[PDB]
């Protein structure tokens, strides 16, 4: 029905889509299982 | 809610595409019809330019002539024109200029004067109950006067 | 609540899925119009390569033994901690009963099939009301 | 509310549309997608003002597929609902939970519990109408509804109204 | 931030990478039914047509050379000296 | 009082009394903030102040420094009737007898309103208010 | 071949690495995972609220993964959690926390020395965070007494003990000699009393890393898309090693809660606390030196996440 | 740095010290699975609408 959410940060509008390999997703999920946050940002905040 | 605190894109501070600062543009259901019906005319001139090389019947007929212009994917705008026209009592942009002159004379917020011009009320308590933001920001006698001049500006078309 | 994925051909839609599964190509395809139904097929043989529900059930457990580089004091403290939590479950009788039954069957030179059938029978009986005792020797024999 | 806001949209074009007249195509697409549709951030987009002075900026080529991406900045007339906003509308569909008021392009719903006690539901009439102690709420009847809450989902916006408070109900 | 034309101090010659990506993207567009600007001599392969357009500088592209400081330049493939 | 200010929140002194206690002019009953806000927020209904049945309306509240309901009602009705009568035939010429007699009539009207009598003379005083308003419009 | 999405497609640019806060772990997770069992009691479906319930991801294609719906070839996975009743330490941070214990007071929670010292003034001018923490650690590790008055300042004065690492624990030595073992709750409290300038002077960023976050309180549970179980011949079902480790964490946590609810033998509480600390420590890194090695029932060591990220031909 | 040898230690120190990555390195763009600034991908290709009318 074209619906999205992100749990724990109150977002239902700004959702980005990215194409990453499945092994990289395994790495990110293992880091999240290891109490490490691999936060991904499509914009450059440091500039 | 309705406490003069809208969203981020609906804040009092707006920015145009040139980079300058502009106040939020709030429209009541009077000139809001003349602006859509207005721009659709120049849109029809733009559609007939590249082609080279009683109150309800005219409304629906013009909405058909403009429906032929568009690709048949925006009929909710025409039904919105029937909604506004069925709920509009104003006409001619000159009188609308007078209405803005009466709304800006009190020094209120654009959303507040939009809710003032968009609602048909007879007493001040009606305007204070339908508009929760206006209850002490302006005198009641002045609102009744505005409703009197507006009552003289409305005419059955 | 539902959660049952059923593959159908939207072009054929004439019969329940009478499909064929191509494992070499990793797809599943309708055997009529030839249209593929799914790509990237998973395997069950490949995940099994690295590796008992009938008796142990869904219970999980892990051993703690000594390490390559460790102290003998920590090995005893971890085993004594499990010795205090061993009362949380009444499954100590199944491992000891299967151990003694294992010793008797290994002493009688009976095949493993009779051992598994006897263990399955003792698991069916276990601790019911109609047993009401017998001092663990008669239920084993 | 009927507001006017400058919106920006990224238009994707197929490599077959790279003729000299492509700008026109842009505007064409810029109409077909924007007018009539809806967004959860700016509300129901009604019209698009300023069709001649449409900025095109510069088109960029994304890697694969070879399609062209454009960033267009324009001025448009949109409609955005708000919570606790007195509006007017006409009923379309009727239900035992309440009648569905039609306010412009938005179909607001009014819960039966959010109605006064004298307003009762009547199914024996054709169409089923809500009869009160003085007013009869039918399909073609005009009702002033005070919107209590609004939902801003992507490309879909629904709101909930009420008429229990004073100075409300049928027009 | 877009260096002007009078301050473009990069090499005017088209490199092998620029020629490669121009022929690859141009050939990919030609494969996707793009308006061809050169009359064909009977070719069927898209890469040969792309090289035919590069031989006459009829490719409608411009290169955005990124500088290490974050800036860039716009060198059109028509003004770039090939080979 | 410190023991009655809301039938649900009658003793909020040890709960840090940071909320006010509004009083509706059609009930004369103390209700704390978190209660009355839900009252007129869910609809204009009556407050359960000791089984009160008079309907509590939305907004139209007031702050009270407490001068007893009798004197507060007498000063509210006193000011309202004083504004209805306005200054008609008061300082028109400088007379002292007829002026004091008319003031005696007004104060007797306010007295009949604060006492109510038998709900018969007060209605005639309301018709007198409509007549005086009609005279002020002209 | 995946299903189309209406979200805007962009590339991945900046990547930020930070610690997982327990509140954010509870805000990301969807299930609590209380039953150490794998599947349901009926030997089918899932346990519903256990180690691998439909609230996480699923495999076998046929299952739909309740909370994403769609399929396994689309399901990214879903996260559970584990709310512990006793805070535990993380292996890869045991040293760092210890260094923090040698850089801050153990009572008033203020940095040792002060900005009036010249060596501290010289060390604070360094722009590199790791070098700042290194030098500041070299200074603060020597002074073992907070002070109330320093000539040209916070109070306290309580003699700062000597923190030594022993058996995944930290023992504090007071000379005054009174030696007491520093518990996780005490260290976490002292970390809760750390001012902004203190930990930001050590190399922490408020929005990303916190010394309180370094101590593990709630544990994320990865979905089966990370640890895919197998059901071979419907009677030979194999579960991954991380699943067994989660079962151990659940048994040790429920055991510790049961022992801490009714009565307090004081010794079984420490045995169950060291047991849970051992299950979490071996869950994060099984190949820890100076500690026993957890072995599976088949005869092989337990495969941890660190083993998946350390050896060759792994994930990198 | 983590790709070469000691992966877990580098990652743990990174998350501990709140480290930020610029993500223009070779291995970084490889891991994320998109174009890197090397050779052909070290420049972007654009289109000039003023050149189509030529
Ligand atoms: Zn249901
Ligand atoms: Zn088929
Ligand atoms: Zn109360
Ligand atoms: Zn009352
Ligand atoms: Zn899922
Ligand atoms: Zn101290």
Curated annotation (Swiss-Prot), chain A:
This is DNA-directed RNA polymerase II subunit RPB2. It comes from the Eukaryota. Zn(2+) binds at residues 6, 9. It is found in: Nucleus. It comes from Saccharomyces cerevisiae (strain ATCC 204508 / S288c) (Baker's yeast). DNA-dependent RNA polymerase catalyzes the transcription of DNA into RNA using the four ribonucleoside triphosphates as substrates. Second largest component of RNA polymerases II which synthesizes mRNA precursors and many functional non-coding RNAs. Proposed to contribute to the polymerase catalytic activity and forms the polymerase active center together with the largest subunit. Pol II is the central component of the basal RNA polymerase II transcription machinery. Component of the RNA polymerase II (Pol II) complex consisting of 12 subunits. The binding of ribonucleoside triphosphate to the RNA polymerase II transcribing complex probably involves a two-step mechanism. The initial binding seems to occur at the entry (E) site and involves a magnesium ion coordinated by three conserved aspartate residues of the two largest RNA Pol II subunits. Belongs to the RNA polymerase beta chain family.
From Swiss-Prot, chain C:
Disulfide bonds: none annotated. It is found in: Nucleus. Zn(2+) binds at residues 9, 12, 30, 33. A zinc finger (TFIIB-type) spans 5-38. Present with 6750 molecules/cell in log phase SD medium. Associates with TFIID-IIA (DA complex) to form TFIID-IIA-IIB (DAB-complex) which is then recognized by polymerase II. Belongs to the TFIIB family. General factor that plays a major role in the activation of eukaryotic genes transcribed by RNA polymerase II. This is Transcription initiation factor IIB. It comes from Saccharomyces cerevisiae (strain ATCC 204508 / S288c). The chain holds residues 16 to 173 of 345 of the full protein.
Swiss-Prot record, chain D:
Pfam families: S1 (PF00575), SHS2_Rpb7-N (PF03876). GO terms for biological process: DNA-templated transcription initiation; nuclear-transcribed mRNA catabolic process; nuclear-transcribed mRNA catabolic process, deadenylation-dependent decay; positive regulation of nuclear-transcribed mRNA poly(A) tail shortening; positive regulation of translational initiation; RNA-templated transcription; transcription by RNA polymerase II; transcription elongation by RNA polymerase II. SMART domains: S1. It comes from the Eukaryota. Coiled coil: none annotated. Belongs to the eukaryotic RPB7/RPC8 RNA polymerase subunit family. Component of the RNA polymerase II (Pol II) complex consisting of 12 subunits. RPB4 and RPB7 form a subcomplex that protrudes from the 10-subunit Pol II core complex. The RPB4-RPB7 subcomplex probably associates with TFG1. Interacts with NRD1 and PAT1. Present with 6420 molecules/cell in log phase SD medium. This is DNA-directed RNA polymerase II subunit RPB7. It comes from Saccharomyces cerevisiae (strain ATCC 204508 / S288c) (Baker's yeast).
UniProtKB/Swiss-Prot annotation, chain E:
The keyword Cell inner membrane does not apply. Coiled coil: none annotated. One of its GO terms (biological process) is tRNA transcription by RNA polymerase III. GO terms for molecular function: DNA binding; DNA-directed RNA polymerase activity. Residues 40-61 are annotated as: Leucine-zipper. Keywords: Cytoplasm, DNA-directed RNA polymerase, Nucleus, Phosphoprotein, Ribosome biogenesis, Transcription. Present with 6090 molecules/cell in log phase SD medium. This is DNA-directed RNA polymerases I, II, and III subunit RPABC2.
């Amino acid at each position: 029905h074209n619906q999205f959410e992100c749990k724990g940060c109150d977002n239902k509008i700004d959702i980005y889509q990215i194409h990453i390999p499945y092994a990289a997703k395994l790495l990110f999920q293992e880091l999240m299982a290891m109490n490490i946050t691999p936060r991904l940002y499509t914009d450059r905040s440091r500039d | 809610a309705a406490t003069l605190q809208l969203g981020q894109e609906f804040q009092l501070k707006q920015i145009n595409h040139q980079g300058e600062e502009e106040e939020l543009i709030a429209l009541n259901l009077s000139e809001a019809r003349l602006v859509i019906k207005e721009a659709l005319v120049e849109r029809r001139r733009a559609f007939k330019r590249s082609q080279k090389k009683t109150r309800e019947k005219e409304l629906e007929s013009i909405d058909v002539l403009l429906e032929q212009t568009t690709g048949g994917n925006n009929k909710d705008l025409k039904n919105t024109m029937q909604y506004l026209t069925n709920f509009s009592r104003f006409r001619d942009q000159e009188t609308v200029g007078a209405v803005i002159q009466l709304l800006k004379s009190t020094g209120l917020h654009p959303f507040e004067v939009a809710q003032l011009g968009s609602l048909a009320c007879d007493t001040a308590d009606e305007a204070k109950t339908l508009i929760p933001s206006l209850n002490n920001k302006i005198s009641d006698d002045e609102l009744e006067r505005i409703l009197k001049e507006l009552s003289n500006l409305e005419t059955l078309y | 609540p539902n959660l049952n994925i059923v593959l159908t051909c939207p072009e054929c839609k004439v019969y329940p899925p009478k499909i064929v599964e191509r494992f070499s190509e990793g797809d599943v395809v309708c055997a009529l119009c030839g249209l593929v139904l799914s790509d990237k097929l998973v395997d069950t043989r490949s995940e099994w390569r690295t590796f008992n529900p009938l008796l142990d059930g869904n219970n999980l457990s892990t051993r703690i033994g000594k390490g390559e580089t460790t102290d003998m004091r920590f090995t005893k403290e971890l085993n004594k901690a499990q010795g205090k939590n061993v009362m949380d479950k009444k499954d100590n009788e199944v491992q000891a009963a299967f151990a003694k039954i294992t010793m008797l069957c290994d002493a009688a030179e009976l095949p493993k099939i009779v051992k598994d059938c006897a263990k399955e029978a003792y698991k069916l009986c276990h601790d019911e009301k109609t047993l009401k005792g017998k001092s663990m020797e008669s239920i084993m024999a | 509310m009927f507001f006017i806001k400058d919106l920006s949209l990224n238009i994707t074009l197929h490599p077959s549309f790279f003729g000299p007249r492509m700008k026109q195509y842009l505007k064409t697409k810029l109409l077909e997608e924007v007018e009539g549709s809806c967004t959860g951030k700016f509300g129901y987009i009604l019209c698009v003002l300023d069709y001649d002075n449409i900025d095109i900026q510069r088109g960029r080529i994304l890697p694969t597929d070879g399609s062209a991406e454009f960033n267009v900045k324009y001025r448009a007339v949109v409609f955005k609902p708000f919570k606790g906003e007195v509006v007017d509308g006409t009923v379309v569909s009727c239900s035992q939970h309440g009648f569905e008021v039609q306010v412009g392009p938005m179909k607001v719903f009014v819960t039966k519990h959010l109605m006064p006690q004298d307003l009762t539901f009547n199914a024996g009439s054709n169409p089923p109408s809500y009869q009160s102690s003085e007013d009869v709420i039918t399909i073609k009847s005009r009702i002033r509804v005070k919107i209590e809450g609004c939902i801003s989902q992507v490309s879909s916006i629904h709101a909930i109204g009420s008429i229990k408070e004073d100075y409300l109900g049928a027009i | 931030k877009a260096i002007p034309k009078d301050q473009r101090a990069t090499t005017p010659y088209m490199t092998k990478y620029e020629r490669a990506r121009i022929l690859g993207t141009r050939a990919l567009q030609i494969s996707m039914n793009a308006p061809v600007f050169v009359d064909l001599e009977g070719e069927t392969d898209p890469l040969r047509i792309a090289m035919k357009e590069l031989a006459e500088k009829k490719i409608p592209l411009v290169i955005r050379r990124y500088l290490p400081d974050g800036s860039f330049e716009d060198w059109s493939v028509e003004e770039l000296i090939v080979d | 009082e410190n023991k009655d200010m809301c039938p649900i929140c009658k003793t909020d002194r040890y709960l840090s009394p940071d909320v006010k206690f509004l009083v509706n002019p059609e009930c004369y009953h103390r209700i704390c903030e978190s209660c009355v806000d839900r009252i007129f927020s869910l609809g204009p209904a009556q407050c359960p102040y000791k089984g009160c049945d008079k309907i509590l309306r939305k907004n139209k509240f007031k702050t009270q420094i407490f001068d007893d309901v009798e004197v507060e009602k007498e000063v509210d009705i006193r000011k309202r009737v004083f504004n209805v009568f306005n200054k008609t035939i008061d300082d028109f010429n400088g007379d002292l007898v007829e002026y004091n007699k008319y003031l005696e009539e007004v104060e007797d009207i306010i007295y009949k309103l604060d006492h109510g009598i038998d709900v018969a003379k007060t209605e005639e005083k309301l018709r007198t208010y409509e007549e005086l308003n009609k005279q002020l419009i002209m | 071949g995946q299903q189309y999405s209406s979200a805007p497609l962009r590339t991945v640019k900046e990547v930020q690495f930070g610690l997982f806060s327990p509140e954010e772990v509870r805000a990301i997770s969807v299930a609590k995972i209380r039953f150490p069992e794998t599947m349901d009691e009926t030997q089918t479906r899932a346990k519903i609220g256990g180690l691998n319930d439909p609230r996480l991801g699923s495999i076998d294609r046929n299952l739909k993964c309740q909370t994403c719906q769609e399929g396994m070839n689309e399901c990214p996975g879903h996260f559970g959690h584990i709310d512990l009743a006793k805070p535990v330490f993380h292996v890869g941070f045991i040293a760092k926390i210890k260094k923090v214990c040698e850089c801050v007071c153990m009572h008033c929670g203020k940095l040792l020395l002060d900005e009036h010292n010249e060596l501290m003034r010289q060390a604070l001018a360094i722009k590199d965070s790791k070098k700042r923490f290194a030098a500041i650690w070299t200074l603060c590790k020597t002074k073992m007494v907070c002070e109330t008055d320093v000539p040209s300042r916070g109070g306290c004065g309580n003699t700062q003990p000597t923190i030594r690492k022993d058996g995944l624990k930290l023992v504090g030595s007071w000379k005054k000699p009174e030696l007491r073992v520093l518990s996780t709750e005490e260290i976490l409290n002292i970390f809760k009393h750390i001012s902004v300038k203190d930990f930001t002077s050590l190399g922490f960023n408020e929005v990303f890393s916190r010394p309180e976050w370094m101590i593990l309180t709630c544990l994320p549970v990865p979905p089966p898309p990370v640890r895919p179980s197998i059901s071979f011949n419907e009677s030979q079902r194999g579960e991954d090693d991380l699943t067994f480790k989660l079962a151990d964490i659940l048994k040790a946590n429920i055991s510790l809660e049961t022992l801490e609810h009714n009565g307090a033998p004081h010794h079984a509480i420490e045995e169950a606390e060291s047991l849970l600390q051992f299950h979490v420590a071996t869950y994060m890194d099984n190949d820890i030196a100076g500690q026993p090695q957890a072995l599976q029932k088949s005869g092989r060591p337990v495969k941890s996440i660190r083993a998946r990220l350390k050896g060759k031909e792994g994930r990198i | 740095r983590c790709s070469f040898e000691e992966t877990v230690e580098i990652l743990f120190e990174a998350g501990a010290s709140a480290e930020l990555d610029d993500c223009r390195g070779v291995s970084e763009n490889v891991i994320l699975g998109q174009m890197a600034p090397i050779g052909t991908g070290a420049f972007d290709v654009m289109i000039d609408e003023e050149s189509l009318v030529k």
